[PDB]
Short mmCIF file of C-alpha atoms in Angstrom, two decimals:
data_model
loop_
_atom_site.label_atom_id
_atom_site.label_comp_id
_atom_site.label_asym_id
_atom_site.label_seq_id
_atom_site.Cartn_x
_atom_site.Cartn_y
_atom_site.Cartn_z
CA UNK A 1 -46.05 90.81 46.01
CA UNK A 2 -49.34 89.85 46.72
CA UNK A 3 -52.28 91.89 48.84
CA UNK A 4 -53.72 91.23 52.33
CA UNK A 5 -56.65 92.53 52.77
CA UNK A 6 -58.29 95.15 54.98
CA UNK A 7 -59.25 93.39 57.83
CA UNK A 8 -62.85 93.99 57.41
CA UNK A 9 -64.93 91.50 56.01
CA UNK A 10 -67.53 91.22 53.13
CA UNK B 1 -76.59 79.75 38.73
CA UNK B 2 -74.05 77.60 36.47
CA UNK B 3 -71.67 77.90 33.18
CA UNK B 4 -71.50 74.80 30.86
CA UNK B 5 -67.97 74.19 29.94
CA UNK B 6 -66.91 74.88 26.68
CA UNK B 7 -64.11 72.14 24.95
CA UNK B 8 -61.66 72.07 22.45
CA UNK B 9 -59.68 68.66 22.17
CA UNK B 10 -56.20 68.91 20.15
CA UNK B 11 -52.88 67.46 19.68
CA UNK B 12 -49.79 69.65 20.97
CA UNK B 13 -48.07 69.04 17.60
CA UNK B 14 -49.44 68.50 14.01
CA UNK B 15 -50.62 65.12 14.06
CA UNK B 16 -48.83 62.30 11.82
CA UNK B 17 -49.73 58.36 12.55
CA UNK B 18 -47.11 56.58 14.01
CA UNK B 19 -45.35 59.89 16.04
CA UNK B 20 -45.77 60.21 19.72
CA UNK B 21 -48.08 63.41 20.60
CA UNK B 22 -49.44 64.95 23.34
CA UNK B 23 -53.55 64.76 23.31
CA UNK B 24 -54.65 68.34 25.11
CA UNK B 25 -58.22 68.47 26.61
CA UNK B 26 -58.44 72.28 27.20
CA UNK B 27 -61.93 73.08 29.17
CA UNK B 28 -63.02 76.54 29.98
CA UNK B 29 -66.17 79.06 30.81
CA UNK B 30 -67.55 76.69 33.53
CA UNK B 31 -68.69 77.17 37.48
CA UNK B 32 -68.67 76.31 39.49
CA UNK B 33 -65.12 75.36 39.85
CA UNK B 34 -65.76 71.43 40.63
CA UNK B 35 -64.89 69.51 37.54
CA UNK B 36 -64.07 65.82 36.56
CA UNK B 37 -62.57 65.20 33.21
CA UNK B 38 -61.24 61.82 31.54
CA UNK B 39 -59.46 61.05 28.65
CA UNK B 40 -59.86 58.36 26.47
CA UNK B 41 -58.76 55.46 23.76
CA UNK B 42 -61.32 53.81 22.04
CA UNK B 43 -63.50 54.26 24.89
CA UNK B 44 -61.00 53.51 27.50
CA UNK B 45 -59.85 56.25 30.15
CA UNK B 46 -56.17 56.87 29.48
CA UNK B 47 -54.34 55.91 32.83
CA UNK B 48 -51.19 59.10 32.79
CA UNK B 49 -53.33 62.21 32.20
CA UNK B 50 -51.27 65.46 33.73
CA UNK B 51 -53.97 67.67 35.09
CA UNK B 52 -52.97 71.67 34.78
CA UNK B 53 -53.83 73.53 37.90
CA UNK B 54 -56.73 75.41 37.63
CA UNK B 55 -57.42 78.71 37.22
CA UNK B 56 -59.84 81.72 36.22
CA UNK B 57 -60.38 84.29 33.69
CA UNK B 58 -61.31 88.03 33.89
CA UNK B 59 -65.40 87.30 33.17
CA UNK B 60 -64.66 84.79 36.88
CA UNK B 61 -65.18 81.67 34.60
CA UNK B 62 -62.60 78.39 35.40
CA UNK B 63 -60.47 76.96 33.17
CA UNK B 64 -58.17 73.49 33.14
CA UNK B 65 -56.19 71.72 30.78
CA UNK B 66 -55.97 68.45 30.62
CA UNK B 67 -53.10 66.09 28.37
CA UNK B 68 -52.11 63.01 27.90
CA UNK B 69 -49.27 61.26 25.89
CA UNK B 70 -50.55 59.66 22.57
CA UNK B 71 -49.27 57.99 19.23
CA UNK B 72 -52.04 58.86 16.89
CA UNK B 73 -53.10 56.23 14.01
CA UNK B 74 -55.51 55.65 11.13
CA UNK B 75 -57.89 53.84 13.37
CA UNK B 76 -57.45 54.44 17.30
CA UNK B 77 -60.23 57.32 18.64
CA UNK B 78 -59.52 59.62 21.03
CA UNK B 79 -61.84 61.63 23.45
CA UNK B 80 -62.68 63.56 26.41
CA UNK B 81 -65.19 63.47 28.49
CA UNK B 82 -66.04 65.67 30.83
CA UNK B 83 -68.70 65.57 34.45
CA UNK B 84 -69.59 69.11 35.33
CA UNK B 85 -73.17 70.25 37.08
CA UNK B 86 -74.66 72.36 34.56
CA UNK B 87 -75.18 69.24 32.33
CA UNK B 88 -77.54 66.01 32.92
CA UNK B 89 -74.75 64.24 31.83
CA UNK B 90 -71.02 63.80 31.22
CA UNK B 91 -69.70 65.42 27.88
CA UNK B 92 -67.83 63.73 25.18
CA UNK B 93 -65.61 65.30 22.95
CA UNK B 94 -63.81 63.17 20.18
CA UNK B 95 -60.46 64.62 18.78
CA UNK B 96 -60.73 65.47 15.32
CA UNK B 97 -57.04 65.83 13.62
CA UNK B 98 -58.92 68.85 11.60
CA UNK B 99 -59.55 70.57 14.30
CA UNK C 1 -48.33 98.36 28.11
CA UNK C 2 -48.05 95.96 31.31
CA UNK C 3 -50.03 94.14 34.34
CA UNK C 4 -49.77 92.57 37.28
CA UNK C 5 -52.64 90.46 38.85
CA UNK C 6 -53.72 88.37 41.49
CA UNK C 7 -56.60 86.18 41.14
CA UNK C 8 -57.72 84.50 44.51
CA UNK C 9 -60.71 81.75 45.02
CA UNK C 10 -61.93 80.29 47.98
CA UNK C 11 -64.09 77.14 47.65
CA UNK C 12 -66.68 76.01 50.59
CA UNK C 13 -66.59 72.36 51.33
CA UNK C 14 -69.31 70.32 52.64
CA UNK C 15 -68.38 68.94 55.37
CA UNK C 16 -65.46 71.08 56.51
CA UNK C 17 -64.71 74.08 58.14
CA UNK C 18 -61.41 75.46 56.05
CA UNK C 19 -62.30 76.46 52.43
CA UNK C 20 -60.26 75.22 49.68
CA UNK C 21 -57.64 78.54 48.85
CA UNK C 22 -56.16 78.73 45.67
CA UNK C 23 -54.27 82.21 44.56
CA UNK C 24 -52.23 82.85 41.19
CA UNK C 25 -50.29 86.20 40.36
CA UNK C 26 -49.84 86.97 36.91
CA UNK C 27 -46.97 89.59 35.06
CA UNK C 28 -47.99 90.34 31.74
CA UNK C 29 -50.57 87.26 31.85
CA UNK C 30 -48.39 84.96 32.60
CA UNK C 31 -48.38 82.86 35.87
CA UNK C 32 -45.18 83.46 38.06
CA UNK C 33 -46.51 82.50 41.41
CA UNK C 34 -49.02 79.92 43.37
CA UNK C 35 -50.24 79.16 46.34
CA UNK C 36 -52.57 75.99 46.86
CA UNK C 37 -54.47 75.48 50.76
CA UNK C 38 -54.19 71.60 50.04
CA UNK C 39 -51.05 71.16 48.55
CA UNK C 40 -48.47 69.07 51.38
CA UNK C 41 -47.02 71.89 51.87
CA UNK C 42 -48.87 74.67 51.96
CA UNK C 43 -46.58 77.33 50.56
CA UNK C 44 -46.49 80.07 47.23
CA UNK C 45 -43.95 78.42 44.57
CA UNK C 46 -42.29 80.03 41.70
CA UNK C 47 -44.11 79.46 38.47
CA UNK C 48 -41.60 81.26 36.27
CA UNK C 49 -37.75 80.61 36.36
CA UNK C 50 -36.94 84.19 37.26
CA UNK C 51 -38.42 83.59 40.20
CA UNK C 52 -35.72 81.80 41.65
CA UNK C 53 -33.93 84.35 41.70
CA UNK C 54 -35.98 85.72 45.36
CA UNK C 55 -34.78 84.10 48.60
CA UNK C 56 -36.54 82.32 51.19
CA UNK C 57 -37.81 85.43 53.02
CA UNK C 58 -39.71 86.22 50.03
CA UNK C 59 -41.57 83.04 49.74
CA UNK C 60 -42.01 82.94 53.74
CA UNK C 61 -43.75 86.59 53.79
CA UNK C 62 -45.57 85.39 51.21
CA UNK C 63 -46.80 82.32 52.43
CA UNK C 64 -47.67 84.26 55.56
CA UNK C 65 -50.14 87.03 53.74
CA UNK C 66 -52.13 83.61 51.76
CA UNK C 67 -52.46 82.32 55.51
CA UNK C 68 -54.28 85.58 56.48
CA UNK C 69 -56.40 85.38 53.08
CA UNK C 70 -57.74 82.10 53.86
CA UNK C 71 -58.98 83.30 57.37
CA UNK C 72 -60.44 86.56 55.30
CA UNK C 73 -62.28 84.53 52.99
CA UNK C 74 -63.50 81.77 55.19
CA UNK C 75 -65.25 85.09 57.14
CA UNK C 76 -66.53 86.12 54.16
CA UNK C 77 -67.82 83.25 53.09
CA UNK C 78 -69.22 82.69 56.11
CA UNK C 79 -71.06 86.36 55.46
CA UNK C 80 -72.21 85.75 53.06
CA UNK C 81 -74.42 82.85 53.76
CA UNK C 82 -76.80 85.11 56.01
CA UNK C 83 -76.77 87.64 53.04
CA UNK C 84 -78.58 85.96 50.86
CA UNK C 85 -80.35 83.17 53.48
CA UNK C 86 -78.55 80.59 52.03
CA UNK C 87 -78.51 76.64 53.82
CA UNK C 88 -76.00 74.64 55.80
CA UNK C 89 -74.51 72.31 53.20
CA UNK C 90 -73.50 73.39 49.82
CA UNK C 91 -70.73 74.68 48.25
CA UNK C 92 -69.89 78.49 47.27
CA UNK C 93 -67.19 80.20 45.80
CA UNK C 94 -65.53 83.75 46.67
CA UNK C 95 -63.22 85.00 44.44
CA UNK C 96 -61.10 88.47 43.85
CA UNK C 97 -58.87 89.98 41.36
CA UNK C 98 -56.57 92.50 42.34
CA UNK C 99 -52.80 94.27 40.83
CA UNK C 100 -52.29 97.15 38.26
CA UNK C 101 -51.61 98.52 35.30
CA UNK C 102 -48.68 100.65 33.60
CA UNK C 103 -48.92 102.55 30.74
CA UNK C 104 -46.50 103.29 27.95
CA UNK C 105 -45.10 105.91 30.32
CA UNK C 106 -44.53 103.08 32.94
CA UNK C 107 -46.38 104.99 35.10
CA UNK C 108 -49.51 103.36 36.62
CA UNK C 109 -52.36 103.30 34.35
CA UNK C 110 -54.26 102.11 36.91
CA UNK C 111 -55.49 99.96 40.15
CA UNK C 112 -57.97 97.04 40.11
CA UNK C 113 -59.96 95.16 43.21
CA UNK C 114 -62.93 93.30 42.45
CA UNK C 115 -64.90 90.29 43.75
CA UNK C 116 -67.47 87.87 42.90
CA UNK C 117 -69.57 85.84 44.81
CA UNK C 118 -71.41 82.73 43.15
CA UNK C 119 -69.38 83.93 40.07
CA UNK C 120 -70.66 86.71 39.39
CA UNK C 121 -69.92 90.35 40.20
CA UNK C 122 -70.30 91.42 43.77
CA UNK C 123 -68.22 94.16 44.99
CA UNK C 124 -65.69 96.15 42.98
CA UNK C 125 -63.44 99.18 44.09
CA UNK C 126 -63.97 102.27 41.35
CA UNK C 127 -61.12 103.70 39.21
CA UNK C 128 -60.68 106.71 41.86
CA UNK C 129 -59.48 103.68 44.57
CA UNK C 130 -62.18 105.61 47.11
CA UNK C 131 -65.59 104.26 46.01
CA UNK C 132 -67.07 100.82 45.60
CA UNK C 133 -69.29 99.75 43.18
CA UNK C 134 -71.77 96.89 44.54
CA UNK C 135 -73.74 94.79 41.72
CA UNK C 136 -76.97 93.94 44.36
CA UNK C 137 -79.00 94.12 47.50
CA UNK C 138 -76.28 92.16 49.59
CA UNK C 139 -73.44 94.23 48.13
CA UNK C 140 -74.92 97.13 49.37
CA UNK C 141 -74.49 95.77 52.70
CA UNK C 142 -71.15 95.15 52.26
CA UNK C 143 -70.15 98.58 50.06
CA UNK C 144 -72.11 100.52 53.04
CA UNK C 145 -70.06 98.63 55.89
CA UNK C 146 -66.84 99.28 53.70
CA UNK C 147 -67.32 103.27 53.23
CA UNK C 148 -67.87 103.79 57.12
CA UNK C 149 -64.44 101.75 58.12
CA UNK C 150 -62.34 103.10 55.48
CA UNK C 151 -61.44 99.99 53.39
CA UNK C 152 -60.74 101.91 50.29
CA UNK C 153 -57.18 103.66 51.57
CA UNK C 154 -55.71 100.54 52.66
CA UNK C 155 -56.11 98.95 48.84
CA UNK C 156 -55.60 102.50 47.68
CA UNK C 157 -52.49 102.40 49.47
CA UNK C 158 -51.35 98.93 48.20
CA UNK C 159 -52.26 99.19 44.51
CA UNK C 160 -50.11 102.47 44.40
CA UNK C 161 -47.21 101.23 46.19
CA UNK C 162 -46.28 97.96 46.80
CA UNK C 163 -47.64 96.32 43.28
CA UNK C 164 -45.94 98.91 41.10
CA UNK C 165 -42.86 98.54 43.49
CA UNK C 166 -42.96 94.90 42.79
CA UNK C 167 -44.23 94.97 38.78
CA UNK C 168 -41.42 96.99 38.23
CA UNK C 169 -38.98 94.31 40.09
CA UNK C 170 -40.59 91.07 38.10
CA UNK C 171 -40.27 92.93 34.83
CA UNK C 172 -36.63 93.47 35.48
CA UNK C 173 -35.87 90.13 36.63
CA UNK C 174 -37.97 88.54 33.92
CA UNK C 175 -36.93 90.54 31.06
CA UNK C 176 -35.42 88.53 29.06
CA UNK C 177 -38.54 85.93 29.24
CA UNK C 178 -41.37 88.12 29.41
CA UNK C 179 -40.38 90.26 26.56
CA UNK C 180 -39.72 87.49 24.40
CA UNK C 181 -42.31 86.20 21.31
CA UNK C 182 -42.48 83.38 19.43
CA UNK C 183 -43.54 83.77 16.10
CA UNK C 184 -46.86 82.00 14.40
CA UNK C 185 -45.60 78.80 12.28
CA UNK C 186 -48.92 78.65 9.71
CA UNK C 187 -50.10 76.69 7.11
CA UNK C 188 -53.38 76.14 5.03
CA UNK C 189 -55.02 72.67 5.26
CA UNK C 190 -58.08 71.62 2.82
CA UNK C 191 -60.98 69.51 4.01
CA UNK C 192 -64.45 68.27 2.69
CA UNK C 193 -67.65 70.01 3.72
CA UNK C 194 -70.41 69.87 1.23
CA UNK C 195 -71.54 69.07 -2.58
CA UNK C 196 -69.70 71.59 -4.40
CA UNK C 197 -67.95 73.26 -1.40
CA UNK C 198 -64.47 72.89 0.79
CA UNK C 199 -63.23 74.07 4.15
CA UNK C 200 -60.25 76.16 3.94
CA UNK C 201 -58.64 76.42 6.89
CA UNK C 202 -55.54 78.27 8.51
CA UNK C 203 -53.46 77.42 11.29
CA UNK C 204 -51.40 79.48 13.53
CA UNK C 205 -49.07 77.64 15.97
CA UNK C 206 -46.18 77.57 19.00
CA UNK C 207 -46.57 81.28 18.78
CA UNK C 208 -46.13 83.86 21.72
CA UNK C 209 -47.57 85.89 23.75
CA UNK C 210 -51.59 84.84 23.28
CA UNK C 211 -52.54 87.74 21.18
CA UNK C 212 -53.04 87.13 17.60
CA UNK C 213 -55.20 87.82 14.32
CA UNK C 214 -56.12 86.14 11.30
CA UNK C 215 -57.95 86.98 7.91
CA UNK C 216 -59.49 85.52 5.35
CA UNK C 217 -59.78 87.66 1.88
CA UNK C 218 -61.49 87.18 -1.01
CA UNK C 219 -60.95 89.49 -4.27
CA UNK C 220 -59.55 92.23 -1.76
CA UNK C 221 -61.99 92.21 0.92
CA UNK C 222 -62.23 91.10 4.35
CA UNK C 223 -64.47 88.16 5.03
CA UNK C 224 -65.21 88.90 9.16
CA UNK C 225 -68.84 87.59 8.65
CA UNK C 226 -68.04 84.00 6.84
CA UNK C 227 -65.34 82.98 8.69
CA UNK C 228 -64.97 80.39 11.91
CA UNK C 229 -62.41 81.40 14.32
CA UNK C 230 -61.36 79.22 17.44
CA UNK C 231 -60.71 80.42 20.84
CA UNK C 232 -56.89 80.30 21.26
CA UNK C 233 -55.97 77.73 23.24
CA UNK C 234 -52.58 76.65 24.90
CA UNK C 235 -50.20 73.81 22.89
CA UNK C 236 -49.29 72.91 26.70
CA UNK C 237 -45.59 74.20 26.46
CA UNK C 238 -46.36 77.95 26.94
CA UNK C 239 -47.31 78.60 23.38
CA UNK C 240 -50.62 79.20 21.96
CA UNK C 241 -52.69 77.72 18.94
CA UNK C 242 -55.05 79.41 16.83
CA UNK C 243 -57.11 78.55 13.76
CA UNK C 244 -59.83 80.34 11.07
CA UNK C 245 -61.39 78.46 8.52
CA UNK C 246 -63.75 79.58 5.68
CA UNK C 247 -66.60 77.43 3.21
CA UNK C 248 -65.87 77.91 -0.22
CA UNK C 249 -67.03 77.00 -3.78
CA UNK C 250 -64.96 73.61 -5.21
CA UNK C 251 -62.60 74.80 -7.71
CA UNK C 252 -62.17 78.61 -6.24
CA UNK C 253 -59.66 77.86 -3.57
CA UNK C 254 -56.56 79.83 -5.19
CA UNK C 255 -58.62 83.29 -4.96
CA UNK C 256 -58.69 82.81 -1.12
CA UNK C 257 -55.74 84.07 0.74
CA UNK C 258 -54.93 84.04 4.68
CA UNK C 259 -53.44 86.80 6.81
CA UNK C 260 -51.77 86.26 10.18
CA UNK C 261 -50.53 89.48 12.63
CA UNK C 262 -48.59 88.76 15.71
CA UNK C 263 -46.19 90.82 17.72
CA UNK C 264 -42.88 88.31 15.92
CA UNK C 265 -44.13 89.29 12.47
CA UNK C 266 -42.19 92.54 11.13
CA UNK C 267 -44.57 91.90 7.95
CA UNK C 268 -47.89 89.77 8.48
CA UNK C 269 -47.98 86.37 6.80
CA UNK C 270 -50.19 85.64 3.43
CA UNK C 271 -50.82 82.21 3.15
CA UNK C 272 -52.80 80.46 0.27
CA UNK C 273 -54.37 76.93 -0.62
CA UNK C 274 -51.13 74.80 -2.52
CA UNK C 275 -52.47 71.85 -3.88
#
């Protein structure tokens, strides 16, 4: 099951 | 900053003349990921060549395999060449059965 | 020991304004799952037979999450560019590894989250899951902005839970082909090299998983420094090929002998020259 990221960005 | 891909070119089985093969092309440690590779008879780019998808090892580098169907003989050559940025020109590798 | 992994990439393209999003999970080092921005389709596929074996809400909340990666990466990417001053044009890559580890004790081992920019190392999340471990000057920018927005608990949070949750589903469901070898069929070829000396070398074929070793002894004694070892390298049909050849004086061939290891060998192989 794969990850979604944080929703802050690089 | 770019990686010059490294190739190996081999047959899926051991090679005997006469037997239908399959010719693998197997390119890896190169970025970016943009690549073109061809295979080829006697200097002729093989029209069926199955491209893997690509993907990535742990150290980021890309990787792809290329194959083709092939009956090896005595006399035909086989090759791959390969385009990538980090060289002035394209690549050729020749099969060697020894190899 | 076992893994799980996912490795993402995002590709700028001149000229267009969605990046090219490609993202492969691995069990054990094996692909299982995929998920390509330009196939027709744009959808995560099975990879691995025992895959099948999820239904269509799987592969739909699935498909979803890559949908929300591409948007996260084409940010990024986007980021990055004022980072590190970099033109209008040109392509760049962004690209992150993420999953676990279980130990012997099936326990996790541990969690993983790293990315690269350009191919090389840019971020990374530390062992603990609460630090980050930035490789430059841009980095920086980005571990600072991470530690004041708490980024670390939310992949904290997924590396404990839902990966082991789901390693430990994909290793029951794929038992029977993940736990499975194949061993090494090797033989001992001969070739020409120079006046007075001969190649010896030993092959190592259709054999499974990837990891492998071969020998070369003389008299009793290793030959490490001597011998030419390949990088193993995929027949195409899920097994691996390997090879390791040593020079050697015309007429000595006999005293050479070849050792192969692999998990399908009870004993380990010894292989000689037969003229």
């Amino acid at each position: 099951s794969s990850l979604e990221n944080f929703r802050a960005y690089v | 900053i770019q990686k010059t891909p490294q190739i190996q070119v081999y047959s899926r089985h051991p090679p005997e003349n006469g037997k239908p093969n399959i010719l693998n092309c197997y390119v890896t440690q190169f970025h970016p990921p943009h690549i073109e590779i061809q295979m080829l008879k006697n200097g002729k780019k093989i029209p069926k060549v199955e491209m893997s998808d690509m993907s990535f090892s742990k150290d980021w580098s890309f990787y792809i395999l290329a194959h083709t169907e092939f009956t090896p003989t005595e006399t035909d050559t086989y090759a791959c060449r390969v385009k990538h940025d980090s060289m002035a020109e394209p690549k050729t590798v020749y099969w060697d059965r020894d190899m | 020991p076992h893994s799980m992994r996912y490795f993402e990439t995002a590709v700028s393209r001149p000229g267009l304004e969605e990046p090219r999003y490609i993202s492969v999970g691995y069990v054990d080092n094996k692909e299982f799952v995929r998920f390509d921005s330009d196939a027709e389709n744009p959808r995560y596929e099975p990879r691995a037979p025992w895959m099948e074996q999820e239904g269509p809400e799987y592969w739909e909340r699935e498909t979803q999450k890559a949908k929300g990666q591409e948007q996260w990466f084409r940010v990024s990417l986007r980021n990055l560019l004022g980072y590190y001053n970099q033109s209008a044009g040109g392509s760049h890559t962004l690209q992150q590894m993420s999953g676990c580890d279980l130990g012997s004790d099936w326990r996790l081992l541990r969690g993983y989250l790293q990315f690269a920019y350009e191919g090389r190392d840019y971020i990374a999340l530390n062992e603990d899951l609460k630090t980050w471990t930035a490789a430059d000057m841009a980095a920086q920018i980005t571990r600072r902005k991470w530690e004041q927005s708490g980024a670390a608990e939310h992949y904290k949070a997924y590396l404990e839970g839902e990966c082991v949750e789901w390693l430990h589903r994909y290793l029951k469901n794929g038992n029977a082909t993940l736990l499975r070898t194949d061993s090494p069929k090797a033989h001992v070829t001969h070739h020409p090299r120079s006046k007075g000396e001969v190649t010896l070398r030993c092959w190592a074929l259709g054999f499974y998983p990837a990891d492998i070793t071969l020998t070369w002894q003389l008299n009793g004694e290793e030959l490490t420094q001597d011998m030419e070892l390949v990088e193993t390298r995929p027949a195409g049909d899920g097994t691996f090929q390997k090879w390791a050849s040593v020079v050697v004086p015309l007429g000595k061939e006999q005293n050479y002998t070849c050792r192969v290891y692999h998990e399908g060998l009870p004993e380990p192989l010894t292989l000689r020259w037969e003229p």
